[PDB]
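Thread: quick sanity check before group meeting

JM: Hey all, I'm pulling together slides for Thursday and realized we never actually wrote out the predicted structure for the chain we discussed last week. Dropping the sequence here so it's in one place. If anyone has concerns about the input, flag it before I start.
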Amino acid sequence: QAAQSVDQLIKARGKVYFGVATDQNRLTTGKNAAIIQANFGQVTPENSMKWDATEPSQGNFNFAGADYLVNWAQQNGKLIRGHTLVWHSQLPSWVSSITDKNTLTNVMKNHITTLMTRYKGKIRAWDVVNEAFNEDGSLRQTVFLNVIGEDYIPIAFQTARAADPNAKLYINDYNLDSASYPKTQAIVNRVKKWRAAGVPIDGIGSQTHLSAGQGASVLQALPLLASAGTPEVAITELDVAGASSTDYVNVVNACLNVSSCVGITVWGVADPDSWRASTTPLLFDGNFNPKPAYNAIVQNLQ
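JM (edit): ok, ran it. Output follows.
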């Protein structure tokens, strides 16, 4: 654990949390648990709440990993973001073989309702729809789009709102890091249109998987995301190739500058456990010691 908590420091600046992705396999090995206890205020399950983990066979739900994380977080005073309900990746083949609109709609609604009702009142925010946009800003042609149509997004959010009215409902995506990117403009426009039609979208999540030197762009992109008029925005899956302090401090300052930015989640604790470990992109090194970027964030927040 680092001595100074970035979560406590960001809360002193008026934000809700600084958190991390984790799961049972992390929490039960190494120094992960102690680091999360001391330094972070929020957890996102890295894998245990995805469709493949939770409903591997239709109607045959598996909550073992998800329950472990929720209970651990509650015991340890950490906020939870649920991740993720509707996504084309980590989707079992029984779902993607369905070609009937009514069948898939009911499957999707049942998946949403079952997961959200189990944890009702315990989960601050859910990523309801993940990675719904192509890079040109059109909607990604996933099984949900192809079989249900564009209404799948409204249906997913309406169903989620009914299941747990206390949760903040997010749409989450990546490559929203530059204000001039086609995808960034498109998500803003479509979220404005959906909200004007009554769809309950409370948040835009920006994954923020950055390359070295790209942090500066977030200073301009995040205010543009906030212009869509959702109550919240968040940085949901931050990591930065090379872990330069300059990039990490820029992302934190972007969130500080945008009132509706509630917090930041970094996508893991220690470099070797990252999905792109070879780029050493996280705040703790392979020996579980804080990196200079951690200390730079602390100093920026003080």
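AS: nice. Residues 182 and 244 are 26 Å apart (CA to CA). The longest helix spans residues 101-118.
JM: adding both to the slides.
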